[PDB]
Amino acid sequence: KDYRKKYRKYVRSRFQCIEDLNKRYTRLRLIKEPIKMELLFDPDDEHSEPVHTVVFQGAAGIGKTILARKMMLDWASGTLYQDRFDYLFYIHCREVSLVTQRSLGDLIMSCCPDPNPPIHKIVRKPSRILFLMDGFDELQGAFDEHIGPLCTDWQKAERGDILLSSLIRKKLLPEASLLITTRPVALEKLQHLLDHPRHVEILGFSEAKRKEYFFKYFSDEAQARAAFSLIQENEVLFTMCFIPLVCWIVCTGLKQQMESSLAQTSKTTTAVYVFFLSSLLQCAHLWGLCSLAADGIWNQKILFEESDLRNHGLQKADVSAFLRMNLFQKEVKFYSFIHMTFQEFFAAMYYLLEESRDVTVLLENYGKFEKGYLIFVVRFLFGLVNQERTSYLEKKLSCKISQQIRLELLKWIEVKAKAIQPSQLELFYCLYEMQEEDFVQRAMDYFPKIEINLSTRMDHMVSSFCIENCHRVESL
């Protein structure tokens, strides 16, 4: 009662910003598989028995973290689940070690402000607890389905993977509620652990909310209308801006153009990322940024210490400049890239830099949870390897290595196409990034039949481009 008040006050302060003012928050579209947040845990016709597990699947950059942080803030302010949950515990998955031994009590205490929380009091009513697991796909290391034995004691220290598996399977605090957010790529791994989950999909920004975002980002109404009109004129940007991270990336780059006229002709997500990074260029620490990202991807480190950045040649003034440029993020003496997609962009760039590791071993670990799935590393490799595209940033890349990698990617597509890791639609996202018709046409010939499941206008745009470049050699 008195501790619940002290805890709620702490949650209200630490969840006030997107960075850690939640007035820049724009409503995200959620669908059940127009769901009202307050009714998420209500049974439909489950004879009055509530739903204890809710899974929010959402693409990278769709706003899973922002939605989870808004949920924490709304609840702490008495706006959400006021009469349903005494406690909401935010489990930031990227900070949870899968090997360190810890109890569920230690985990709950790590979410508390003070060193001595009344853990026995908190756990007295498990059904009044909602565990908000943000970013299942961001748990560093392997998350094996065979792990065990399962734990049924909230006080027992277990390896992080056994602890989280026991919690997800509802072995530990069986009637506590659980809200897990994940990229659709990890849904395969997660579904095996889930007990009667309610599945919800985060679709991102509607066309109306895309405009709303641009108008909220730009203080000047004239600048907001000019930036939104640019997006309306460009099919690719208009279509990609359903992803709130893309809205932020585009708005940020257009802001610098406004300082110095508005024109963005980006046709791929690689073009969008290069356009953004080019706006920060006044670059010296490119080999250091790329090696840091590649080391963090291959060795599973999303949070870096001051010691980690020092190992890659990033001094005090450099880490402060990257923080100001919105390339680095300050997290709880820990640093990370502003988004995991940027860490994967610099990891892809590491393989092409001229002064570079083996792309064959990288492709062997593609689609593995242990490595983060390497979706954007591979997509950005297809994009950056495109010779028909250049910039000052891309001039630092080697044409010799890019030509070798281009041949390896074509041989990789051939095997995937000729023979469940990269779907056919995922190969289309890769080919769409490549853009270059000779490669695209050669790769499209490897497919014996087109078998795709389209869900979004982005899926249609990408697959339609690939199918238009899939014409039989003999045809006409």
Ligand X SMILES: Nc1ncnc2c1ncn2[C@@H]1O[C@H](COP(=O)(O)OP(=O)(O)O)[C@@H](O)[C@H]1O
Ligand Y SMILES: CC(C)(O)c1ncc([S@](N)(=O)=NC(=O)Nc2c3c(cc4c2CCC4)CCC3)s1
Q: Minimal CA–CA distance to 372: which of 301, 443, 444?
A: 301
Give 102's strand partners.
158
Give, as one character, the DSSP assignment of residue 272. H
Q: How far is CA 291 from CA 71, 170, 309, in A?
A: 36, 40, 10
Q: Say whether 285 counts as a known binding-site residue.
A: no
Radius of gyration from C-alpha coordinates of the chain: 23
Binding mask 125-164 for ligand X (x = CB under 6 A): ----------------------------------------
Question: Is 63 a binder of ligand X (CB under 6 A)?
Answer: yes
Span of 114-122, 237-245, 403-411, 440-448 interacting with ligand Y by CB under 6 A: 237-245
Coil/strand/helix, residue 363: helix
Span of 98-106, 179-187, 256-264, 278-286 interacting with ligand Y by CB under 6 A: 179-187
Spatial separation of the C-alpha atoms in residues 296 and 377, rounded to whole Å = 12
Q: Which is nearer to ligand X, 206 or 391 (CB)?
A: 206
Q: Which is nearer to ligand Y, 214 or 428 (CB)?
A: 428
Give 88's strand partners.
130
**135 phi and psi angles, rounded to 5 deg:** 85, 65
Binding mask 309-348 for ligand Y (x = CB under 6 A): --------------------------------x-------
Question: Is 25 a binder of ligand X (CB under 6 A)?
Answer: yes
Q: How do beta strands 198-204 and 328-331 pair?
A: unpaired
Name the token pair of 4: 């619940």
**3-state SS track over 204-243:** ECCHHHHHHHHHHHCCCHHHHHHHHHHHHHCHHHHHHCCC
Question: Is 423 a binder of ligand Y (CB under 6 A)?
Answer: yes
List all residues 6 or more positions away from 449 whose beta carbon is below 8 Å from its beta carbon: none
Q: How many residues bind ligand X (CB under 6 A)?
A: 17
Question: Is 193 a binder of ligand Y (CB under 6 A)?
Answer: no
Q: Which is nearer to ligand Y, 172 or 245 (CB)?
A: 245
Span of 7-15, 55-63, 345-353, 396-404 interacting with ligand Y by CB under 6 A: 55-63
Binding mask 288-327 for ligand X (x = CB under 6 A): ----------------------------------------
Q: Which is nearer to ligand X, 127 or 326 (CB)?
A: 326
Question: Is 90 a binder of ligand X (CB under 6 A)?
Answer: no
Q: Say whether 53 counts as a known binding-site residue.
A: no
List all residues 6 or more positions away from 353 whose beta carbon is below 8 Å from its beta carbon: 286, 287, 290, 396, 397, 398
Tell me the residue type at 318. D
Q: Which is nearer to ligand Y, 139 or 185 (CB)?
A: 185
Burial class (CB in 10 A: 0-12, 13-18, 19+), 252: middle
Interaction with ligand Y in 362-381: which residues (CB under 6 A)?
375
Interaction with ligand Y in 62-121: which residues (CB under 6 A)?
none
As measured in angstroms, the least distance from the Cβ of 231 to ligand Y is: 14
DSSP 115-143: SS--HHHHTT-GGGEEEEEE-GGG--S--
Q: Say whether 141 counts as a known binding-site residue.
A: no
As measured in angstroms, the least distance from the Cβ of 186 to ligand X is: 12
Q: Which is nearer to ligand X, 63 or 117 (CB)?
A: 63
Question: Is 26 a binder of ligand X (CB under 6 A)?
Answer: yes
As measured in angstroms, the least distance from the Cβ of 250 to ligand Y is: 10
Coil/strand/helix, residue 427: helix
Spatial separation of the C-alpha atoms in residues 372 and 298, rounded to whole Å = 9
Span of 17-25, 35-43, 110-118, 309-317 interacting with ligand X by CB under 6 A: 17-25
Q: Minimal CA–CA distance to 143: which of 162, 171, 130, 167?
A: 162
Question: Is 330 a binder of ligand X (CB under 6 A)?
Answer: no
Question: Is 184 a binder of ligand Y (CB under 6 A)?
Answer: yes
As measured in angstroms, the least distance from the Cβ of 65 to ligand X is: 3
Identify whether the C-beta of residue 415 lies closer than 8 Å to the C-beta of residue 364. Answer: no
Residue from 11, 28, 93, 462 that binds ligand X (CB under 6 A)?
28
Spatial separation of the C-alpha atoms in residues 378 and 432, rounded to whole Å = 12
Q: Say whether 58 counts as a known binding-site residue.
A: yes
- Which residues lie near ligand X (CB under 6 A)? 18, 24-26, 28, 58, 60-66, 244-245, 248, 339
Name the binding residues for ATP: 26, 58-66, 339
- Which residues lie near ligand Y (CB under 6 A)? 59-61, 183-185, 240, 243, 245-246, 269, 341, 375, 423, 425-426, 429, 458
Name the binding residues: 26, 58-66, 339
